Structure formats: structure tokens, C-alpha cells
Amino acid sequence: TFGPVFEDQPLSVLFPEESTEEQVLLACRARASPPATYRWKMNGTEMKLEPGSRHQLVGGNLVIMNPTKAQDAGVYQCLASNPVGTVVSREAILRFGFLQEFSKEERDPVKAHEGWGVMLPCNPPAHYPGLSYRWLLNEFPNFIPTDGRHFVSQTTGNLYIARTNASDLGNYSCLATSHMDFSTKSVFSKFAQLNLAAEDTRLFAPSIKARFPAETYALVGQQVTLECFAFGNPVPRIKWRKVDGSLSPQWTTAEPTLQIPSVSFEDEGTYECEAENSKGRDTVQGRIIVQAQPEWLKVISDTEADIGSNLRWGCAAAGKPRPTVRWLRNGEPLASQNRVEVLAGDLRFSKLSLEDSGMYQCVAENKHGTIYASAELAVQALAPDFRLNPVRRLIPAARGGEILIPCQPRAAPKAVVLWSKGTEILVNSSRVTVTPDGTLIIRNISRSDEGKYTCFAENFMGKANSTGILSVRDATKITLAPSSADINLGDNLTLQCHASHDPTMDLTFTWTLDDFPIDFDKPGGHYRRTNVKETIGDLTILNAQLRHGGKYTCMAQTVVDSASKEATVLVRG
């Protein structure tokens, strides 16, 4: 059995008022064996799913019929529950697109002069999502022309005219258009009137009226617009620059509206916009800081772990502003416990148990978003198995030496190792040591130590035993060590290595120069074996040169043990 891992997460749904169907489907599907029970949260609490009600679970999908803004707008969160564990899905926002009408009362006309700029505030109503604004010169559908004299704001909707003349007299009206996922809605305002006086025949300095704000909190990958429209006679050129840097040249325009389509982290900084004509200039500044969603850097994965082991899980996320990772067991938040410790970051287990098995979730959150990561912790109880890594079945041992017999079975938790020789239980003494990781240390080994070494590994699930046959032979001992000597260039030198060993076994002689071995397969070679017998292993250097000096080690070994002695040969004084 394995826990629920999601393949369909719920998406945030903008439901239009001009909809084609009357149902909202929020999707949730998670792979588990057995298939999981799905429960939904509405605003944190557990919402009820009786038959005959307006909330229907079709398998894992939630279908809401008859939705309204006053009932069903908000937080939807799916939960998949197994007997292994319970996982919590991603945040779904069901949000309702609305567009209120304008005020139907009388609005005052605006008086101005010919040749000066005029403002006309739109006063737009409450809305979701962001409106696209237009203005009119006459009735519907006669729009304003989109020239360089009249400007409709994309942020506040207000109409700004840099210079009025005799052709601007008409019936003004604001207009708004909401573009949604399934429909498009358009409203228009109450009608306005502009009254104009006689012409002031002067040229004057500009002043910036339509202003982009002081801090624009951008996000990565989304289009950012800024406005710097101004008054003027004549019409002023608009210049954009960066105060603490330089602009990228793919989108530099001489326009009152600056639209940046792909915002990355080089777009963060201080911006200055400028209206300039032949009577002078005006500048105003602002800032764009570029913020980011959380993405994961490293996550947690499905861990089979033993009972009682230490375990560290790391889960880290990147984002500007920098996220607080918060942890979950089975849908409820995991605090610091008796064995489970959250550092709001990496999660440690001191001594695991069977209560700590389940689905664990890593939540990364800031004010730009919240992401989730799931992992199954399977804390396993295991019997001691000597099939994979047993006690050594045949243990050769040197007479008078010291051997190490490990008993390390595959066990969860750490098994009690009780050693025995035949039917006699081995205790610590001054000669035989039972170390509690499993190893048996036998020093000063004689002929009474041969036999039946049986390890009993025991924990609360079960018991097992393993058997090592131990036989004690004589050790390999060098009887004549080689002697260090200094020679000249081209002399003969013979080094002795006599060994003694148990005559059941087979002794061989390796000779090494600075712990690197000596080739003897060259015909006419300069290294020769001398007095080749069972116990005599002598080495002759013939015609010695400058590369033949160093430390020669005679290593007389059998297949179960070894002995080594050293000598130093120098070839030049």
C-alpha cells in the first residue's frame, strides 16, 4: 500500500456573471492503492456532502450547481485520504467576475480654456478583473480618437486632454470593458459636458498630471504598464529612463505609456519619466521592485526508514519575498513534538516509530502564493535476516592474533546480539569481547577457540541466528627480515625474506617497491627471484641504476593472512 500522490490539482476559477452553464467543477485526483476518499475544505472547515444537496462529489471532482457571489466565493481545498495518510491539495480560489453600473445621478460640467489641458475623472465602479478603459466624444458607439492629444488612463480610467481646441466640444462619457474567461462585458458612464472659454495664445511649461505610482510591485513574466501623460502647448515628447541603471532597448518608445511585456530581475530599480517641449521640461520618478512566486529547489521524497533511526528531511523554496516553509502531518499542522522537530525548514526525527508513518507535506508560502510537496514516510518493522549480510561462515584465525567477527543483520530496529560458542553464552572478559554493535573481538587465540560461533539477533518482532565455523592455524611469521644496504651504480644486491607458516596452507611471496609491485616477466630482466623454494623468497637486483633505490617491502602472504618487512636500498651517495 502507498499513499495518495496528486495528478490533478484544483485551479482557481473566475466564474463570469454572463455564464453558459450553471456548474463549477473543481478537480481533484490522487493515485493511491486502495483509491482514496476525498473531502473538501471550504474556508478551513469541513464542508458536508449529503445527497440532495448542491455540493456533489463525482468521484473526486466537486460539482457546485447554482453558484452565487454571496455563498460560494472563496477557498476550496481538496483532501485525499487513504489508511496510509491524508494529503492536502493546492489552494483553489473560486472568484466571481462582476461589473456594477455607473451612477445615474447628475454630474457637473467642467469649464476650461481653449489651448489649455483639461482633466475629466471617470469615477469607475467596483469590478473584477481589471477593466480596459475608453472615453467618448459623442453617444455610443462614437469613441474618442486615439491620437496624441487625448489620453484615457489604464489605471484610473480618467481622461486627460493636453490641449483643447474648437473640435473637442461634444457629449463625453467614460466607458469600461471587462474581458473574462467565457464572456465580455461593457458598460458606459453618465454623459458629461465640457465648456470652453476664449483662446489663450501662449506657450507654457508642462506639468505631469497622469502619474504612475511610487512603488509598482511587479511579478516575473507579467506585463507592467506605466503612465506619464501631461499637459502642454505644444504637445510634449515623453522620455523614459532608469535612474540606477539603463533601459533594455527592445521596448524603448517615445510614448506617454510605457508597457513592459516580460519583467525579469533586471527591470527592478528606479524609473524617471519626462515631459519636454520647447518651453521646458518636467520629471517625476517611481520604483519597480520585481517579486517572485515560490518554486522548489529541493523537496522531500518517499522514504522507507527503520524504527528508531535519525532522519533529516530538507525542503527549500525560492521566491521574493522569501518563503516560510511550514510542515504538515496528514492534513493538520506539525509542531515540535516529543520525537519530531520542525525548525521551519528541515525536519528531524530523533527516534522513529510506527506512529510517525504517514504522508508528510511541505508548504511554502508568501503573499504571492503557496505551494505543496508530499512524501510518504514508511517506518518499517523488519525481522533479522541473515540472507543478505550474514556472519562469516568460515572464519580463519591466526594463533596468537586478534580477530573481528561482525554480526550485522538487516534489522529494524537495532537487534540485541547474543554470541555463543556451542551452547555457552559469551560474556565480556579480558580475552573475549562482545562489542554492542555486533562484533566479537577475540584476542590471544589458541586451539580451544575452534568451533561453533552462533550469533543470536533478537528484537521484538523476531529472532534469528547465524553460524561461523572457526579454525585456528599458525600465523605467517617472517623469520629473517631483509637488511638495508647502500650500493653503487651497477652492483649486484640480494635481499633475504624467509617466512614460516602453517603447512596445510600455501605461501606466496610478493615483493613491492615503495608499495608498488615488481614485474618478473621480462626475459633478461633486472629483478630476479633467488633460491625459489617454499619458505625462501629472495630478491636480486642486477645492474642497479638510479630508479632502483627506495623502500622494498617483502610481503609473504597466504590467502587468509599476510606478513610484511621492509628494507632500504640506496644506489648513489
Add this chain to the structure above:
Amino acid sequence: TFGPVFEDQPLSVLFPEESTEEQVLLACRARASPPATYRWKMNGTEMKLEPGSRHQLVGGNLVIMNPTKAQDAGVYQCLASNPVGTVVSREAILRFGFLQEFSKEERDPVKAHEGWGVMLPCNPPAHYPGLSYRWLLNEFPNFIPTDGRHFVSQTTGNLYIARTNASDLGNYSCLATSHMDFSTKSVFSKFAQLNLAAEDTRLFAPSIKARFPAETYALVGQQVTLECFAFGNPVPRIKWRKVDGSLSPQWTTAEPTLQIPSVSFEDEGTYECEAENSKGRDTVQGRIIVQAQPEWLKVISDTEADIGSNLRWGCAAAGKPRPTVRWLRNGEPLASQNRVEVLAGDLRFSKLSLEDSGMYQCVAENKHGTIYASAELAVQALAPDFRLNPVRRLIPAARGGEILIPCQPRAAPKAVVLWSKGTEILVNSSRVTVTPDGTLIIRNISRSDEGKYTCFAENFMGKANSTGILSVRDATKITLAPSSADINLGDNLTLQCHASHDPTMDLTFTWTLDDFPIDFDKPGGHYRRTNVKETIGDLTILNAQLRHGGKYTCMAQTVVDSASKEATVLVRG
């Protein structure tokens, strides 16, 4: 399913002629799942087990009833067969004990002198096992007295008298006794006559007549007897010594028969025995060579191995004479093959396959005996499984750096790795490579490399896929390295470390001294952080002493990457 491992091997049975029952049980039992079919070999060929015949399988045991020496004296060798493999047991000798009668014809009398020693050969018949010999002075049942004047040999049975006198006249007869596992048999010889002349009143030098042989090939743990009886007037003292060593003092006797109960390898050498009286001495020599059975030093074990892997199994035996080690597959002997190498020793597989699964046996054989060791080789075909070692899930990468993504699944044999990005299969080029162990190496990494990398592992059992989501972030770069400086004792020194990183992540600064870290938790400590900001990580050494000189490394890291710069601070000129 697992192979047959023996728990009952057959033992060599000496069957008596004076038997209590008429059946021979030779035992064979091997643990296997399913339980094994047992076939016996007798003298190498397969022996037929029809109902109504005189050879009955009671499960695994062989019962031979009505046994005779002319039919059933021979070797028996058990075989356990399952569909995994076939194992061959240790050889059991069924050998029949027999004791023939003496010759019933007339034997000649022996004439000698009074005071001189006499020999009387027994001429014993054919026998198994070794007989214990006695002689007589008259008819049955009075024996010879066991004094120092008359000696019965344990090797040839011949009676030797060192000095004859007037009380030795009688009816002599040899006698032999066989001690066996279920009965004891005794025979006695044809009657003899010793004729004696007048007494020679002289004292003379001894001469050794009953001689221990020149080479006595002993074994370990076996009692060895030697004889050095001699003639003489008076009765000579017998001395034993070692020529190439010294005797152990636990068994030194002044006796004509030297019996050593426990023979080890210090008993091997040259021996001299001596008969001495007041008219002189005599010495003769021999040799005892201590030999051994094969014992194993290192055996083979039950191995699950992949298809196509190299595999070396060592198998080694100790014993004098030194054992030739032979290998078996399934009852037939394994020579060198197209993929299987036997070097009469270690066994090498170059590329394994499904034909090479089965039970493999290791035989050690010399002329003192043969021993066996069995191991299952399970050559396994495996599908690619990414549950234990996947392609890593959420990959970070530096912008313009270098990554390696391993696709190493658990697969038997080595799976073909086909990498992909989305739906398009990655080829070698000059920017991205696919190494054939599974490693996708990407250099010069930009924003077009961000996405979904799927490894396909394919072999002839099956296919699997794994998926790594890779995001490309800007690397940690040190914008201003620390500078090396020379200071005096007690000066302040400030080292700068300015770094730059992608601001989606978080940056930390580790400061190390000769790649060992710097403690900052001391109040009033001599190492201080300076200008603690997001990107500025400076270090001030205050009141510098002689232990503060070395190489300081500033390692500015995030959690997915790092950058390091070095400086050298010395405190004394």
C-alpha cells in the same frame, strides 16, 4: 524457489560379517523448495531404483538389504535435484570387514640356542581393519606374558624373543583380534614348536630386528606407533630421539614401542631409535611426515547476479598434500567454456546469462580425501525500477554553468538510456551530450533549457521513464574577492567578500580558515562579522596573534550552488 543445500551427507560405513541387522542405511537429505528428487551414484554410474529390487529409497535414505562383499562393496554418492539445480554429496565408502582363517597345513619348527634371541613370523591373513596381535605359549586361552623378554609386533604380528631360556618351551601360536563397530572377532594360528640347544654363556652386542619403517605418513589427530625391539644378553634399554629436533616430554618412555596419541605438525621429522646394553649399542632411523585433510579456507556463497556482469568466485582449501580444486555444474564437471573460466581455483564469468543459473559446487581433492561446497547462482532479469534511485525530481541549474543528470535505474542488464526534453529526443551535439551510462551533461545553460527532461530506460524485459523538472537560475558570483595582506601582531584587518546571486533564492556566507570554519558565537571574540547585509559578508580580525595566520576562504553559497575566493593573512615577518 531456492536450491538444495545439504543437511545430511552420507558417512562411510564399515559393515561387519558378524552383523546384527541385514540392512545398510546411507543418508541424504537436502533442504529445497520444492523438495528434491534423490538419485544415487554407485561407482560413477546411475543406479536403478525399481520396486522389487534390493535398493530402496526411503525418502532420501538408501536401504541396501542382503549385502555381500562381492556385490555391494563400493562408493555411494547422493544427488539432490530440483528445477534450480543438482548437488552432489560427499562420497561414502561401503566397505566390508572380513577376517580369513589361517593356513591349516604343517609349519616347520625353529631351532635356536639358549640365551640367544629368536624370531617367529606370524604370517597373518588378509584383513580389514588393522589387527591387534598376540602370541601364545600353550593352547587356548593362555597367552604370552607381556614382559620385557617377549614382544608381539603391532605392524607385522611377528613374535621376537630377546633372550630364550628353559621356561620358554611350549606350543607357540599367533593370534589376531579385529575390533570393529558392532562386533569383535578373534582368530588363532596353526601351532608352532621352538627347539632349543645348550646355553651359550656370553654377553653380546644387540641387533635391531623389529624395525619401524623409513617413512611413516601420519595424519593430524591420529595415534602413531613405532617399534624398535631388539635381541640381546642382557635385555637392552631402548632410547628414542629426534635427529632434526627434540621430543615433546609428554610421551617420552624407555620402551621398545613408542606410541604418540595426538600427532600435530611438530612431529614431522627424522627419528632415531637405539638399543643399548653394557656390551654396546645399535641405532636405526626413520621419518614421520604429517599430512592433512582438506579443510576449506574460503567458500562460495549464494549469489544473485545480473545478466552480463563479470563475476569472480574464489574457493580455496588448506591441507597437506596441497589440493587441486575442481568445479561442478549440476553433477557434470565444468571445464572452460564460451563465457565460463575455470583456472582450477577461482571461477570467472565474463558475461552472465540465464543458462548459467544453477547450483555450482567446489571440490577439493587430494589423496587423503575430498570435500565439497555448494552455492546457488541466480542470474536475474530485472525491469527498470525508478522507485529506489530515480532521476532527481526538481533540478536546479546555474546560468552558463554545467550540469550532469544521472539516469541510473535498477536494471538487469544495462539498459539503453534515451533522453528527451518534452517530446524531442536529445542527440549528442557540441552543447549537450548523453553519456552512455545514463548521464545527460548540459553546458552553457540558458533559459531555453528550462523544462521537462524525461529519461527512457529500455531493455528486452521492459521499459520505464523518469522525469526531472529543471529551472535555470543565475549563479553565485563573487563580485569582489578578498585581498591578501601582511599585518603585525595585534592589528585589525578587515577582509571584504561581496557576492551576487539570483534574488529569488537566499544567500549565506561561510568563512573558513585553512578550510576549517570560524566560530562567531563568542562574546568579545576576536573574529567579527562586518557590514552584515544580504550581499556583503566581511570579516574583521581584531587583536591578531600567531594562530590567526593562514589562508582564509570566503565561500558564499546558496543552497543549490556556491562560490569561493581565497586570501592569505600573515601576522609575523
